[PDB]
Write a protein that binds this ligand. Structure first.
Ligand SMILES: C[S@@+](CC[C@H](N)C(=O)[O-])C[C@H]1O[C@@H](n2cnc3c(N)ncnc32)[C@H](O)[C@@H]1O
Ligand SMILES: [Zn+2]
Ligand SMILES: [Zn+2]
Lengths: 283, 120
Protein backbone atom coordinates (compact mmCIF):
# COMPACT_ATOMS: atom_id res chain seq x y z
CA UNK A 1 0.00 0.00 0.00
CA UNK A 2 1.17 3.55 -0.85
CA UNK A 3 0.76 4.65 2.73
CA UNK A 4 3.13 1.92 3.89
CA UNK A 5 5.87 3.72 1.98
CA UNK A 6 5.07 7.07 3.60
CA UNK A 7 6.57 7.88 7.02
CA UNK A 8 3.10 7.81 8.65
CA UNK A 9 -0.39 9.36 8.57
CA UNK A 10 -1.43 12.98 9.21
CA UNK A 11 -4.88 13.79 10.60
CA UNK A 12 -7.05 15.04 7.69
CA UNK A 13 -9.38 17.97 7.75
CA UNK A 14 -12.16 15.38 7.21
CA UNK A 15 -11.75 14.55 10.92
CA UNK A 16 -10.70 17.97 12.17
CA UNK A 17 -14.19 19.32 11.33
CA UNK A 18 -16.21 16.60 13.08
CA UNK A 19 -18.24 17.04 16.26
CA UNK A 20 -18.32 13.88 18.38
CA UNK A 21 -17.90 12.72 21.95
CA UNK A 22 -14.59 11.55 23.31
CA UNK A 23 -14.60 7.72 23.08
CA UNK A 24 -12.10 5.03 24.03
CA UNK A 25 -9.30 4.49 21.55
CA UNK A 26 -9.64 0.97 20.06
CA UNK A 27 -6.87 0.05 17.60
CA UNK A 28 -7.00 -3.28 15.77
CA UNK A 29 -3.24 -3.96 15.90
CA UNK A 30 -2.43 -2.69 19.45
CA UNK A 31 6.22 -5.02 16.14
CA UNK A 32 8.49 -4.56 13.16
CA UNK A 33 12.15 -4.52 14.28
CA UNK A 34 14.99 -2.80 12.45
CA UNK A 35 18.17 -3.79 14.36
CA UNK A 36 18.24 -0.27 15.77
CA UNK A 37 16.21 1.13 18.70
CA UNK A 38 12.54 1.59 17.75
CA UNK A 39 12.84 5.33 18.52
CA UNK A 40 15.39 5.56 15.70
CA UNK A 41 12.66 4.65 13.24
CA UNK A 42 10.02 6.78 14.98
CA UNK A 43 12.16 9.89 15.03
CA UNK A 44 13.34 9.43 11.45
CA UNK A 45 9.74 9.12 10.29
CA UNK A 46 8.77 12.27 12.16
CA UNK A 47 11.72 13.99 10.50
CA UNK A 48 10.69 12.64 7.10
CA UNK A 49 7.23 14.15 7.58
CA UNK A 50 8.71 17.47 8.72
CA UNK A 51 10.81 17.45 5.54
CA UNK A 52 7.47 17.90 3.68
CA UNK A 53 6.46 20.83 5.89
CA UNK A 54 7.48 24.50 5.47
CA UNK A 55 9.90 24.51 8.40
CA UNK A 56 12.11 27.54 8.96
CA UNK A 57 15.75 26.37 8.81
CA UNK A 58 18.15 29.25 9.63
CA UNK A 59 21.85 29.29 10.31
CA UNK A 60 22.60 28.43 13.97
CA UNK A 61 19.10 26.85 14.17
CA UNK A 62 17.83 26.67 17.78
CA UNK A 63 16.32 23.28 18.63
CA UNK A 64 15.13 22.07 22.06
CA UNK A 65 14.30 18.41 22.60
CA UNK A 66 12.36 17.55 25.77
CA UNK A 67 11.97 13.98 27.05
CA UNK A 68 15.17 13.00 25.22
CA UNK A 69 16.25 10.31 27.68
CA UNK A 70 15.33 6.68 28.13
CA UNK A 71 15.54 3.98 30.80
CA UNK A 72 18.68 2.84 28.94
CA UNK A 73 20.41 6.15 29.66
CA UNK A 74 20.89 6.98 25.95
CA UNK A 75 19.04 9.31 23.53
CA UNK A 76 18.33 7.77 20.13
CA UNK A 77 15.98 10.62 19.08
CA UNK A 78 18.67 13.22 19.79
CA UNK A 79 21.07 11.33 17.58
CA UNK A 80 18.48 11.26 14.80
CA UNK A 81 18.08 15.02 15.25
CA UNK A 82 21.85 15.39 14.96
CA UNK A 83 21.78 13.35 11.74
CA UNK A 84 18.83 15.30 10.37
CA UNK A 85 19.52 18.96 11.31
CA UNK A 86 22.18 21.24 9.76
CA UNK A 87 25.65 20.75 11.19
CA UNK A 88 25.51 24.23 12.75
CA UNK A 89 22.12 23.65 14.47
CA UNK A 90 22.28 23.98 18.26
CA UNK A 91 20.57 21.03 19.99
CA UNK A 92 19.59 21.31 23.63
CA UNK A 93 18.02 18.28 25.21
CA UNK A 94 16.42 17.51 28.54
CA UNK A 95 15.02 14.69 30.59
CA UNK A 96 14.04 14.09 34.18
CA UNK A 97 16.63 11.31 34.33
CA UNK A 98 20.33 11.18 33.66
CA UNK A 99 21.34 10.16 30.14
CA UNK A 100 24.11 10.72 27.60
CA UNK A 101 23.50 12.24 24.18
CA UNK A 102 24.94 13.94 21.13
CA UNK A 103 23.23 17.22 21.99
CA UNK A 104 25.25 20.41 22.28
CA UNK A 105 23.68 21.07 25.71
CA UNK A 106 22.10 18.42 27.94
CA UNK A 107 20.04 19.42 31.02
CA UNK A 108 18.89 16.94 33.66
CA UNK A 109 15.70 17.45 35.68
CA UNK A 110 12.09 18.46 35.21
CA UNK A 111 11.60 20.54 32.06
CA UNK A 112 10.25 23.36 34.30
CA UNK A 113 13.86 23.80 35.46
CA UNK A 114 14.86 24.59 31.85
CA UNK A 115 15.27 28.35 31.48
CA UNK A 116 15.17 29.45 27.85
CA UNK A 117 16.70 32.91 27.72
CA UNK A 118 16.01 33.55 24.03
CA UNK A 119 13.33 32.36 21.58
CA UNK A 120 13.93 29.06 19.79
CA UNK A 121 13.13 27.83 16.30
CA UNK A 122 11.97 24.24 16.81
CA UNK A 123 10.62 22.40 19.88
CA UNK A 124 10.45 18.58 19.89
CA UNK A 125 8.83 16.95 22.91
CA UNK A 126 8.62 13.26 23.62
CA UNK A 127 7.71 13.85 27.25
CA UNK A 128 5.35 11.25 28.68
CA UNK A 129 4.57 10.22 32.27
CA UNK A 130 3.75 6.47 32.29
CA UNK A 131 1.55 6.91 35.36
CA UNK A 132 -12.68 9.52 32.77
CA UNK A 133 -10.16 10.90 30.22
CA UNK A 134 -9.80 14.56 31.16
CA UNK A 135 -7.36 17.11 29.76
CA UNK A 136 -4.01 16.81 31.46
CA UNK A 137 -1.64 19.42 32.95
CA UNK A 138 1.78 17.99 33.86
CA UNK A 139 4.56 19.33 31.53
CA UNK A 140 1.89 20.56 29.10
CA UNK A 141 1.56 23.75 31.20
CA UNK A 142 5.25 24.43 30.66
CA UNK A 143 5.07 23.71 26.92
CA UNK A 144 2.06 25.98 26.42
CA UNK A 145 3.83 28.86 28.12
CA UNK A 146 6.93 28.16 26.01
CA UNK A 147 4.89 28.44 22.81
CA UNK A 148 3.45 31.75 23.96
CA UNK A 149 6.78 33.28 25.08
CA UNK A 150 9.91 31.47 23.91
CA UNK A 151 9.12 30.39 20.34
CA UNK A 152 10.18 32.52 17.33
CA UNK A 153 7.53 33.74 14.96
CA UNK A 154 7.86 31.23 12.10
CA UNK A 155 9.07 28.54 14.52
CA UNK A 156 7.50 25.10 14.77
CA UNK A 157 6.72 22.42 17.39
CA UNK A 158 6.23 18.63 17.41
CA UNK A 159 4.73 17.47 20.70
CA UNK A 160 4.04 13.87 21.59
CA UNK A 161 0.52 13.11 22.79
CA UNK A 162 -1.47 9.92 23.33
CA UNK A 163 -5.04 8.90 24.09
CA UNK A 164 -4.54 9.81 27.80
CA UNK A 165 -1.55 12.22 27.62
CA UNK A 166 -2.98 15.36 26.03
CA UNK A 167 -3.93 18.97 26.81
CA UNK A 168 -6.92 21.12 25.83
CA UNK A 169 -4.79 24.28 25.83
CA UNK A 170 -2.12 22.76 23.60
CA UNK A 171 -4.68 21.88 20.90
CA UNK A 172 -6.05 25.43 21.11
CA UNK A 173 -2.51 26.87 20.66
CA UNK A 174 -2.25 24.97 17.35
CA UNK A 175 -4.66 27.69 16.08
CA UNK A 176 -1.80 30.21 16.39
CA UNK A 177 0.30 28.48 13.75
CA UNK A 178 -0.07 28.83 9.99
CA UNK A 179 -0.86 25.10 9.78
CA UNK A 180 -1.14 22.15 12.19
CA UNK A 181 -1.96 18.46 12.30
CA UNK A 182 -1.44 15.29 14.32
CA UNK A 183 1.14 12.98 12.75
CA UNK A 184 1.38 9.24 13.61
CA UNK A 185 4.47 7.32 12.54
CA UNK A 186 4.05 4.05 10.68
CA UNK A 187 6.72 2.62 12.98
CA UNK A 188 4.40 3.01 15.99
CA UNK A 189 1.04 2.92 14.19
CA UNK A 190 -0.48 0.50 16.70
CA UNK A 191 -0.14 3.06 19.55
CA UNK A 192 -2.54 5.97 20.17
CA UNK A 193 0.64 8.12 20.15
CA UNK A 194 0.75 11.03 17.73
CA UNK A 195 2.81 14.15 17.36
CA UNK A 196 0.89 17.36 17.50
CA UNK A 197 2.59 19.53 14.89
CA UNK A 198 2.35 23.30 14.82
CA UNK A 199 4.10 24.61 11.69
CA UNK A 200 5.16 28.34 11.49
CA UNK A 201 4.07 30.15 14.67
CA UNK A 202 2.17 33.40 14.02
CA UNK A 203 1.56 34.66 17.54
CA UNK A 204 -2.09 35.31 16.72
CA UNK A 205 -5.24 33.20 16.46
CA UNK A 206 -5.70 31.92 12.93
CA UNK A 207 -8.09 29.05 13.74
CA UNK A 208 -10.47 28.86 16.69
CA UNK A 209 -10.12 25.35 18.10
CA UNK A 210 -12.10 23.65 20.85
CA UNK A 211 -9.29 21.51 22.27
CA UNK A 212 -11.53 18.96 24.04
CA UNK A 213 -13.60 18.44 20.88
CA UNK A 214 -10.45 18.20 18.74
CA UNK A 215 -8.92 15.43 20.88
CA UNK A 216 -12.24 13.61 20.44
CA UNK A 217 -11.80 14.11 16.66
CA UNK A 218 -8.26 12.74 16.90
CA UNK A 219 -9.43 9.57 18.62
CA UNK A 220 -12.35 9.27 16.14
CA UNK A 221 -9.77 9.47 13.34
CA UNK A 222 -7.55 6.81 14.94
CA UNK A 223 -10.60 4.59 15.47
CA UNK A 224 -11.63 5.04 11.81
CA UNK A 225 -8.27 4.60 10.08
CA UNK A 226 -6.47 1.33 9.33
CA UNK A 227 -2.73 1.89 9.75
CA UNK A 228 -0.12 -0.80 9.08
CA UNK A 229 3.07 -0.97 11.06
CA UNK A 230 5.86 -0.19 8.67
CA UNK A 231 9.29 1.19 8.13
CA UNK A 232 9.41 1.01 4.32
CA UNK A 233 9.86 4.79 4.15
CA UNK A 234 13.36 4.36 5.63
CA UNK A 235 14.63 2.29 2.66
CA UNK A 236 15.77 5.28 0.62
CA UNK A 237 17.47 7.77 2.93
CA UNK A 238 19.12 9.66 0.09
CA UNK A 239 17.06 12.80 0.84
CA UNK A 240 16.73 12.40 4.61
CA UNK A 241 18.73 15.44 5.76
CA UNK A 242 16.90 18.67 6.44
CA UNK A 243 17.19 21.02 3.48
CA UNK A 244 19.66 23.85 4.17
CA UNK A 245 17.25 26.70 3.54
CA UNK A 246 19.25 29.63 5.02
CA UNK A 247 15.99 31.06 6.37
CA UNK A 248 16.54 34.74 7.33
CA UNK A 249 16.09 35.88 10.97
CA UNK A 250 14.74 39.42 11.35
CA UNK A 251 14.00 41.55 14.43
CA UNK A 252 10.78 43.50 14.04
CA UNK A 253 8.41 45.40 16.26
CA UNK A 254 4.87 44.04 16.27
CA UNK A 255 3.87 47.39 14.79
CA UNK A 256 5.88 46.51 11.67
CA UNK A 257 4.51 42.98 11.17
CA UNK A 258 2.34 43.54 8.07
CA UNK A 259 0.73 41.29 5.47
CA UNK A 260 4.00 40.63 3.61
CA UNK A 261 5.69 39.53 6.84
CA UNK A 262 2.77 37.29 7.82
CA UNK A 263 2.79 35.72 4.38
CA UNK A 264 6.58 35.07 4.61
CA UNK A 265 6.21 33.61 8.13
CA UNK A 266 3.35 31.37 6.93
CA UNK A 267 5.39 30.04 4.02
CA UNK A 268 8.34 28.96 6.08
CA UNK A 269 10.50 31.70 4.64
CA UNK A 270 11.17 33.89 7.68
CA UNK A 271 11.80 33.81 11.42
CA UNK A 272 11.29 36.77 13.80
CA UNK A 273 13.32 36.67 17.02
CA UNK A 274 16.45 37.96 18.64
CA UNK A 275 19.71 37.08 16.90
CA UNK A 276 21.62 36.98 20.21
CA UNK A 277 23.84 34.21 21.54
CA UNK A 278 21.57 31.48 22.84
CA UNK A 279 21.68 31.01 26.63
CA UNK A 280 19.78 27.92 27.83
CA UNK A 281 20.51 26.81 31.38
CA UNK A 282 19.13 24.97 34.38
CA UNK A 283 17.57 27.16 37.05
CA UNK B 1 25.42 -2.63 34.20
CA UNK B 2 28.07 -5.04 35.35
CA UNK B 3 30.85 -3.74 33.09
CA UNK B 4 29.73 -0.16 33.83
CA UNK B 5 30.29 -0.94 37.52
CA UNK B 6 33.65 -2.51 36.75
CA UNK B 7 35.25 0.45 34.95
CA UNK B 8 34.44 2.60 38.04
CA UNK B 9 36.49 0.45 40.47
CA UNK B 10 39.72 1.03 38.53
CA UNK B 11 42.36 3.56 37.50
CA UNK B 12 42.58 2.28 33.86
CA UNK B 13 38.99 1.96 32.55
CA UNK B 14 40.11 1.24 29.00
CA UNK B 15 42.14 -1.80 30.08
CA UNK B 16 39.41 -3.02 32.43
CA UNK B 17 36.74 -2.92 29.71
CA UNK B 18 39.00 -4.62 27.18
CA UNK B 19 40.16 -7.34 29.62
CA UNK B 20 36.53 -7.88 30.62
CA UNK B 21 35.27 -8.48 27.06
CA UNK B 22 38.42 -10.39 26.15
CA UNK B 23 37.54 -12.92 28.88
CA UNK B 24 33.97 -13.43 27.69
CA UNK B 25 32.24 -10.49 29.36
CA UNK B 26 29.16 -9.19 27.60
CA UNK B 27 29.86 -6.08 25.46
CA UNK B 28 28.18 -2.90 26.50
CA UNK B 29 24.77 -2.86 24.85
CA UNK B 30 22.47 -0.07 23.66
CA UNK B 31 24.97 1.63 21.43
CA UNK B 32 22.83 3.93 19.25
CA UNK B 33 23.13 2.44 15.74
CA UNK B 34 21.79 4.81 13.03
CA UNK B 35 20.12 4.00 9.70
CA UNK B 36 22.14 5.58 6.90
CA UNK B 37 22.52 5.49 3.14
CA UNK B 38 25.64 3.40 3.04
CA UNK B 39 27.19 5.91 0.63
CA UNK B 40 29.56 7.80 2.93
CA UNK B 41 33.31 8.35 2.75
CA UNK B 42 33.99 5.78 5.47
CA UNK B 43 36.12 7.98 7.78
CA UNK B 44 36.20 7.00 11.46
CA UNK B 45 34.46 10.00 13.10
CA UNK B 46 32.36 12.60 11.32
CA UNK B 47 29.82 15.42 11.57
CA UNK B 48 27.23 13.36 9.70
CA UNK B 49 26.97 9.61 9.07
CA UNK B 50 29.73 8.55 6.67
CA UNK B 51 29.36 4.78 6.69
CA UNK B 52 30.26 2.73 3.60
CA UNK B 53 28.58 -0.53 2.62
CA UNK B 54 31.17 -2.24 4.87
CA UNK B 55 30.32 -0.28 8.02
CA UNK B 56 27.65 0.84 10.47
CA UNK B 57 27.29 4.30 11.99
CA UNK B 58 26.74 4.98 15.70
CA UNK B 59 25.90 8.09 17.64
CA UNK B 60 29.24 9.07 19.11
CA UNK B 61 28.37 9.48 22.78
CA UNK B 62 26.76 6.01 22.92
CA UNK B 63 29.98 4.29 21.87
CA UNK B 64 32.28 6.25 24.17
CA UNK B 65 33.16 4.30 27.35
CA UNK B 66 33.88 7.51 29.26
CA UNK B 67 30.50 9.00 28.31
CA UNK B 68 28.53 5.80 29.04
CA UNK B 69 30.17 5.23 32.44
CA UNK B 70 29.99 8.93 33.37
CA UNK B 71 33.74 9.08 34.15
CA UNK B 72 36.45 11.61 33.33
CA UNK B 73 37.54 11.71 29.71
CA UNK B 74 41.28 11.03 29.20
CA UNK B 75 41.67 13.65 26.47
CA UNK B 76 44.08 16.39 27.50
CA UNK B 77 41.51 19.01 26.47
CA UNK B 78 38.84 17.34 28.62
CA UNK B 79 36.68 17.24 25.47
CA UNK B 80 35.26 13.99 24.12
CA UNK B 81 36.29 13.03 20.60
CA UNK B 82 33.00 11.20 19.83
CA UNK B 83 30.22 13.04 21.58
CA UNK B 84 28.03 15.06 19.24
CA UNK B 85 29.57 13.29 16.25
CA UNK B 86 29.02 10.02 14.39
CA UNK B 87 31.42 7.07 14.60
CA UNK B 88 31.82 4.54 11.79
CA UNK B 89 32.50 0.93 12.88
CA UNK B 90 33.50 -1.96 10.59
CA UNK B 91 30.50 -4.22 10.09
CA UNK B 92 32.50 -7.21 11.27
CA UNK B 93 32.89 -5.49 14.68
CA UNK B 94 29.27 -4.66 15.49
CA UNK B 95 29.15 -7.05 18.44
CA UNK B 96 31.20 -4.61 20.57
CA UNK B 97 31.42 -1.05 19.21
CA UNK B 98 32.71 0.32 22.51
CA UNK B 99 35.44 -2.31 22.50
CA UNK B 100 36.36 -1.54 18.90
CA UNK B 101 36.69 2.17 19.68
CA UNK B 102 38.91 1.53 22.73
CA UNK B 103 41.04 -0.88 20.66
CA UNK B 104 41.77 1.42 17.71
CA UNK B 105 42.83 4.95 16.70
CA UNK B 106 42.10 7.14 13.66
CA UNK B 107 44.97 8.26 11.43
CA UNK B 108 45.92 11.83 12.20
CA UNK B 109 46.17 13.00 8.60
CA UNK B 110 43.80 10.68 6.69
CA UNK B 111 41.13 10.34 9.47
CA UNK B 112 40.36 6.67 8.63
CA UNK B 113 40.72 3.86 11.15
CA UNK B 114 44.23 2.46 11.07
CA UNK B 115 43.91 -1.12 9.79
CA UNK B 116 40.34 -0.37 8.67
CA UNK B 117 40.60 2.08 5.77
CA UNK B 118 43.74 4.16 6.29
CA UNK B 119 45.82 3.72 3.12
CA UNK B 120 48.80 5.73 4.40
C1 LIG C 1 9.29 7.44 25.89
S1 LIG C 1 10.44 8.38 26.88
C2 LIG C 1 11.55 9.19 25.65
C3 LIG C 1 12.34 8.23 24.74
C4 LIG C 1 13.37 9.15 24.06
N1 LIG C 1 12.71 10.29 23.45
C5 LIG C 1 14.18 8.40 23.00
O1 LIG C 1 14.76 9.07 22.10
O2 LIG C 1 14.25 7.16 23.16
C6 LIG C 1 9.56 9.66 27.86
C7 LIG C 1 10.49 10.60 28.66
O3 LIG C 1 9.76 11.76 29.16
C8 LIG C 1 10.52 12.22 30.32
N2 LIG C 1 9.70 13.20 31.13
C9 LIG C 1 8.45 13.02 31.61
N3 LIG C 1 8.05 14.12 32.26
C10 LIG C 1 9.06 15.01 32.18
C11 LIG C 1 9.21 16.26 32.66
N4 LIG C 1 8.24 16.83 33.38
N5 LIG C 1 10.32 16.96 32.46
C12 LIG C 1 11.34 16.38 31.70
N6 LIG C 1 11.20 15.09 31.20
C13 LIG C 1 10.05 14.43 31.46
C14 LIG C 1 10.70 10.86 31.08
O4 LIG C 1 11.76 10.99 32.05
C15 LIG C 1 11.03 9.84 29.96
O5 LIG C 1 12.41 9.64 29.75
ZN1 LIG D 1 32.84 10.57 25.61
ZN1 LIG E 1 46.05 7.43 7.07
Amino acid sequence: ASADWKPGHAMPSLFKVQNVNLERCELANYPMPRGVHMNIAKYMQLCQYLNTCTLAVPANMRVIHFGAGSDKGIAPGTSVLRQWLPTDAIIIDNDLNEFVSDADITLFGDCVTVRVGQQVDLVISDMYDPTSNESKALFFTYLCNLINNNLALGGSVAIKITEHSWSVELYELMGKFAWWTVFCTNANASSSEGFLLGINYLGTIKENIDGGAMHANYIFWRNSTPMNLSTYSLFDLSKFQLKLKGTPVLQLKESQINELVISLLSQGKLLIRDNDTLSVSTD
Amino acid sequence: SSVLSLVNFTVDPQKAYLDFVNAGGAPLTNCVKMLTPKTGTGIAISVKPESTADQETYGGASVCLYCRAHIEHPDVSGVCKYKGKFVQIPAQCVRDPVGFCLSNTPCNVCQYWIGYGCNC
